[model samples]
Every structure is written in structure tokens, then in C-alpha cells.
Target: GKPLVVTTIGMIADAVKNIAQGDVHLKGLMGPGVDPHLYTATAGDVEWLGNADLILYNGLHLETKMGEVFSKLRGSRLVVAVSETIPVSQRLSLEEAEFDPHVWFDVKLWSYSVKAVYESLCKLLPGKTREFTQRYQAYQQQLDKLDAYVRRKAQSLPAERRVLVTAHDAFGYFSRAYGFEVKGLQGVSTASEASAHDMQELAAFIAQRKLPAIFIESSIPHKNVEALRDAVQARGHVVQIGGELFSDAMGDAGTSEGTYVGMVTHNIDTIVAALAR
Candidate 1:
């Protein structure tokens, strides 16, 4: 019988689907435009989790509200946090003893998650080890190419022009990996509110730097970004709403932006296009 695998976010589900290739029944709890930070499980979600043979989620508080649910199911099911495979030294800290959970923003770093999925799948279906290994290798190659593509695109922009302002602080790994100065109205988790002081300070920075654009995330509201833009305008520097970035969630399922690779490519391309005048 095929294992029922449940993943919390679409990104992880997509990775598992690529590696599993229908060997397992996969269900992603969070879909397009869903925010994991504040997402509370519905009754149906708990049912699915309880019935699943294996469950995977992004830990490090990425799925903030779902921590207890994962804890409760761990004793009975195989629950894994794929992002935990990333080495701590490679992870960025948001504050004291708190690490950033947005490792997917860095393509190379995200290979760890893919590897974790392959290992977990192999563990679940020992008979399919060789097949899983082959698929994992293939996916790794694709990720290598994707990482290079992002690097090339990031390199296209001048260092000073690489400032990326957005609705939330989901891009710390992105900034570290790609050499951009990132600013967010809200902190890493969208659950955190963006203070007026935060907005004013960010707006002042943008105006002083004469930055050309700011971005909105697909999972977050646009009002804060629009307000930030207006604040910049008030300071006499007009910043455009560069584009919508797929931060916590990917784009619609049928679209290219729905996939992890496509989402990263879209972000880098959008940033480069808007900032590289």
C-alpha cells in the first residue's frame, strides 16, 4: 500500500512530489497564497494529519501556529522538519537563539530540504531506494542550475542598486546569498505587525537612498507596502511597487511561479528588472 504523505506547505509538497513521483499519496495542507506563520489547522487538516503515515513541515517557527499539532502527532506518525537538515552554521539568526526558517530563498541551501525528502522517502519505502536516489540526483542537478541562474541574475545588478524592500522580512537568506540589502515593513513572520515607526524609518531610508522600488508578497496584504510607498513619496522620492514576490507561499498551481524553481527565478528576474535601470 502506498504511504499517505502530508506536507504543511506547497513548496515542500512540490519537492516531495518531484522526488516521490507518485510513489506515495501526497497532500499539501497549505496551498497557493497560504501563510504558514499564522495558519491554524482546520478540523479537516487535523484529520488528514492524523491519517497520514508521514508528515513534513518547515520548522524554526515558520509554521508558528502549527507547532503543537506537529508535536501531538509525532508520537504516532513520522513527522519531520525538512528544513532542519540545513546546518545551523549556514542558517541566519533573526534574534538571540532564533534562526530564520526561510532557507528556500537560497537555492543551494534548499538542496538540503530536497535531500531530506529523498532520505525520508527512502526510509519509508526501502524497496525504492535506488529509484529515489536517481530522482534525488536529477533534482539536485536542476537545483544546481537554478542556483547558478539566480547568481547570474543577481550579479547583473550593481551592488548599490540591490536593495530589496518588501512587506515582510522573509528575504534575509536571499539577501545573504545574493548580496542584496533587504528591508521589510514587518518582521520575518507576517504574524508580527509593522509599526508606524518601522514604516517611517524604512520610508526615510528609501527616500534618502533614492531607491527605485519596493515589493509586495503574495501571501501578505498590499496596503502596508502601498503605505510605505506613499511615505517615500511624501519624502519626495517616488518608489514603484516593483512586483509581487512569492515569499511564504508560491503562486497558483498551474502557473510557473507555483513551483519552487519558477518562484525563485521569477523573484530574481523581477528584482533585477525593477532595480537594474
Candidate 2:
């Protein structure tokens, strides 16, 4: 019997799980708590990549450290860089080094990710190609539905309320796709620590706007978010921590929010409802 496939990011895992019909028994190697950007591949990861029939990585360098090694493994396995479908023009370049690797926040853009996976699987398992086609279309329709839902919800917020300030600039794609202004204390890549200036500027933004809520990402430590939240409150604005959003990683396996679709839906609802009230 053949073994199941695997993906580096939960977004890609969700795509494979949907396109493979769940019967193929695709595996998500990176756990719920693991952040792909900083993840280091181990000997076990090497063995799994060797054994698996396919390897789908986010590939705009999300796995900064492991990318070269996985690129080396592309010979014997079906190694796919899903975000390659997105054109270079649309990507946000940062610090003269790397592009913002968080594309899953934009559901429409991520829909292209699923298509990239579908085409890759067709190229790999040509036998199940037709099934992958149907499944891809089916899942794409759901993504379309989710995109419309999020957009409609976002439209309900006032123009000023459309500003999205988070711990990091992870929502750049989301802001670009939807109609929101995105700001973060830290830059898109989480490679650096938040400096005093970052907090000072963010505190000033909070104090100026009198925003009632801010968000914390689940993948990174909440210490920074708590600091910013405290800073905003000290200025006399009643700031609150909205909820932990799935930034770098998805929720736990088997839960509804564990899937990419569920993650987007949960985030949209949380953000729209949080800002509306």
C-alpha cells in the first residue's frame, strides 16, 4: 500500500486534504503549534520527505531555513511551491531581503494556492487527476463563498473602522485583498524583536484613534501584544485584547478552525464583530 502525502503549511495541508478527498490520507507534518517560517527540518523530517510521494511547501521562503534542503529533495519527490502562482508584482517586498510570506490571509489569493496544488497533484498522481480536478473546483467554490462573506462583513464596518492594527504586519495580504488599512508594530517577517520606537508609534496610533480592540497572534509570544495593549490603555482609551488569531499556523487538528477555510471564517467573524460593537 502507498503512504499518504504531506505539506509544510496548514494552508497547503487543507488544500491537499480537500483535493485528495481525505481518502488519500494526506498528512500535515507541521503541527498546529509549529510556525513554518522558523521551523527547522530534522532527521525525521528528512525521512518523511524521502518517503512521501509529494511535498507541498509555501515556497516564497516561508520556511527560510529548511527551503534549501527541501529544494535539494525535489529530485525524487513531487516538491511544490504553491505561492509561485501569485505574480511577483502583487507580493510585498520587505527590508530589501524577502517578500511577506503570509498569503493565506487573502482567501482569493490562497484559492490560487489550491489550484497550484491541484495542478501539481495531477502532474504527480496522473491516475487520480480527474478526481483532483472535481475536488479542486468544489473547494474553490467554498473559497469564493468565504471571500464574499468576509467582504460583505467587512463592508459593514465604517470607513475609519476598516483600519486593521495587529501585533505584526501579517495582515498585509488581507488588507490588500479586502478594503482595510493594515498597520503592525513589527514588520511582516518576525525575525526581529519589537523595539521601543515600534511600541511608541503603535501607542500613539492607538491613542490617536481611540480604538477599542487590538489582536494578538497565536504563533508568537503575547508579551508584545500585552505591552501594546497596556500602552493603549494607559492613554485613557479602553483597549482590549480581541482574540488570538491564527497567523503563522492554523488551529489544532480535527477542529473546525483547524482547516484553512475555518481559520479564515473564524478570523473574519471575529474581526468584523469585534470592530462593529
Candidate 3:
């Protein structure tokens, strides 16, 4: 029987799909617009987790509400945090102790997660290890090309114009990898509210810098960004809502932005288009 694999997020699910290559039964618990930070497991989700032969989640507190659930099941099930594969030295620290979990934004760093998935799949399906290895190698090459594409796109933007302001601090890795300075109205996790002070401070930064645009995330509401635009205008600096970015969550399943590579490409292109002019 095929291994029943359950993933907490679409990004992980997509990686598993590519690596598993239809050798396993894959299910992603969270979809487009679902904010993982605030997401608590439903009864159905618990059932799914219980029944799965292997469970994969993005650790580093990405799924803030599901830790207990994972802990409870870990004794009897194979549960893995793919993002934990990233070395602590390589990961960005949001505070004294907490590391940022939005590593998928960095294409090169994200390949580590893919490798973790591949290794896990090999362990689960030793008989198909050779086939999975080939698939992993092919996918890794694709990711390398994707990383190069992001780098090429990032190079097109001038250093001064490469500021990214979004609803949350989900792009620390992106900024580090691509040379952009990032500002998020909210903190690392969407669980924290964007206070008036936070918004005003960010707006001041935008107005002072005369930045062309800020962005809204797909999983988050536009109201905060709209408020930011208004605040910027009040300071005599106009900032456009550049475009919607796939932040913590990706786009719809059938869309190009749904895939990890496509999502990154869309983001870089959108940022360049709005900020370059």
C-alpha cells in the first residue's frame, strides 16, 4: 500500500508531490488564503493526521497553533519538520531566540526543504528510493534554475529601489537572499496585530524614502495596506499597493502562482514592475 502522507501547508504538499511522483497518497491541510499562524486543527484535521503514515510540517513555529497536535502524534507517527533542515546559522532570527520560518522565499535555501522531503520519502519507500532519487535530482535542477531566475530578476532593480513593504514580516529570508530591505506593518507572524504605531512608523519610512509602492499579501486582508497608503498620502508621499504577493500562503491551486517556483517568479516580477519605474 502507498504511504499516506499529510502535509500542513500547500508548499510542503507540492514538494512531496514532486518527490513522491505519485508513489504516495498526499493531502495538504491548508489551502490558499489560509493563515497557518492562526490556524488550529479541526476534528477532521486531527483525523487526517492520525491516519497518515507520515506527517510533514514547516517548523520554526510557522504553524503556531498546531504544535501540541504534532507532539501528541509524534510518539506513534513519523512527524518531520522540513524547515528544521535549514541550519540555524543560515536562518534569520526575528528576535533573541525566535527564527523566522518563511524560508521558502529564498529559492536556494528552500532547496534544503526539498532535499529533506526527498530523504524522508526514500526512507519511507526504500523500494522506490532509486526512482525518487532521480526525481529529486531533476527537481533540484529545476529549483537551481528558479534560484538563478530570481537572482537575475533581483539584479534588474536598483539597490535604492529594492525596498519591500508588506502586511507582515514574512520576507526576511527574501530580503537577505535577494538584496531587498523589507518592512512589514505586522511582525513575523500574522498573529501579531499591526498597531497604529507600527503602521505610522512604516508609513513615515515609506514617505521619507519616497518609495513607489508597498504590497499586500494574499493570505492577509487589504485593509491594513490601504490604511498604510492613506497614511503615506497624508505625509505627502503617494505609494501604490504595488500588487498582491503570495506571502505565507500561495495562490489558488490551478494558478501559476500556486507552484513554489511560479510564486517566487511572480513576486519578483511584480516587485520589479512596480518599483523599477
Candidate 4:
């Protein structure tokens, strides 16, 4: 039996599980498609955190409401923010130094996190460093290919059609990585509410461009996107609901999208299929 490790979201859990390879007992607080922005820890989770040997979470304020809780835990245990490996300059900041927390959207940027997780794991199991290093290298190779695949598919779409419309501004990193212009109804955080004015403005943007398709996120509700679609039609431009994206969370367990590489590949395929006209 290995030490107990608790992770915050499915994405972080997925990476840790792959790296640990059953050497450690893993507990994930948030399941597939669970929004971390509004998710607060329960009593059970707090207890689990207190008991776990290690804690890993995606930082950059992705877990919007858990700062105080994590801060408290940091005093007693090794609670790692896996995404801190991303250099400050490379991160996209909406406010000064307040980087967008959704770095997982960019495959290249996300690759940096593999090392972060690997090093954390190595610290816990020094004797198993060889095994962890091997797994980390293999995982990094997969990410390299995923990055290439995303680039190829993105290149397939004509430059003018590279606009991605989604429920929120989560894909800024993805757009920057793959050379697409991104527009969303809500701001970067899902906690931000979308008003009628916001919807109307996005509708106008879509209608004005006659953009081919928009996307809905699995974690976010579809009704707002549906409203945007209707608004686009009313303005005499037809925009389809492209597909569901893994925005804040990944897909269900045991599915291809349950893994990070699969989640990113799924998003690329879905977007290319709908918008590469």
C-alpha cells in the first residue's frame, strides 16, 4: 500500500493516476464535468484533505473559492498547485498577473504540467523515481503528438473560418496556441453571469461574421448557447451549436475524454468537424 493522495479535479487526478500507476491510493474530490469555480469543499473533503499524504490542485485560481481552505492545509501538509510550473510570462492575464487558469486548453502549455506532477510524485516516492521518470517521458511524448495533431487540424480550416464561439472565454490559450480568434458569451470565469446585453452583443458578432458554428461546454449549461443560436437566427445568420467541449472539466470516467490527451483531441476533432467548412 502507498501513501494517500488527494487531487482536486478530474484533470489533475487523471495525470496523477497515470504517473502513480497504482503505487499510491488516489482520491479525487471533483468528478467529471464538475465546475471547480463555484465548488467549495465539503466536510468529508476537508477531512480527506487532512488525512491525505499529499494534495495536488490546479492553481492560478481555477478553484476560485478554495484559496482559504488550501492555504490552511498548506501549513500542515504538502499541497501542490501543479500548474505553477507554467512560467509567469507565458500565461494569459486578464488582470495584471492574474493569469487565466485554463492552461489545459493548450496542449503545449499543458505539457509543462506533466513535469510538475512528476516532480511532486518523485518527492513523495524517492525510491520509485525511475518509474515516475519513465512514465513522465512517455506522457510528454503523447502530448507532443497531440500538439501536432491540433496544429494540423487547425491549419485545415481557412484563416477566416478560425473563429471559435463558445459559452465562455475559456479557450483563449487554445486560440493562441492554434491560431484561432476566440469569442464567448460569458467572461473567462463560469461564475460570471451572462446578461441579455451580453447575449445580444455575441449574437451580433456571430451574425455580422456569419460564423459557421458555436460550441457548448459539458460543464456549463447548454441553454445559454441555445439562446445565442436563436439570437443568431433572428438576426438572419445561421449559427449551429457546433459541439460540446470539455471546458472546466473532462468527460465521464472510462471514456476516451476522461484522459487529458483524449479530452483535448476530442475538442479539436469536434471543432474541426463543425467549423472547418
lDDT of 1 by residue, 5-51 (tens): 89988888878877888899988899887889989889999999999
* Model 3 per-residue lDDT at 87: 92
Query: Residue 182's C-alpha lDDT in candidate 1?
Result: 96
User: Tens-digit lDDT track for model 2 on 1-277?
Assistant: 5445778878888888888865465777676767676787778877777788888888777777786778788887888888977887777777757788788877888887788888877776788888989998999998999888888888988878877777787888888888887787667767777788888778878779877677777677789888988887787776677677778788887887888888888787777766776
Q: Which sequence of candidate numbers ranks them by TM-score, best first?
A: 1, 3, 4, 2
Worst 10 residues of 1 by lDDT: 89-98
Q: Candidate 3 on 201-275: residue-level lDDT in tens?
A: 899999999989999888888898989999999999999999898888877787878877788788998888889
Please list the C-alpha lDDT of all candidates, in the order they appear: 0.89, 0.79, 0.88, 0.87
Which pairs of residues clash in candidate 1, taking residues 3 or more apart in a chain or in different chains?
A: none
Cα RMSDs, all models? 1.1, 1.6, 1.1, 1.2
TM-score of each: 0.97, 0.94, 0.97, 0.96
Instruction: Point out where model 3 deviates above 4 Å.
Output: none
Compared with the true structure, model 4 gives a TM-score of 0.96
Tens digits of lDDT, candidate 4, 78-100: 78998878997888999674689
Off by over 4 Å in 1: none
lDDT, candidate 1, at 169: 94
Off by over 4 Å in 2: 95-97
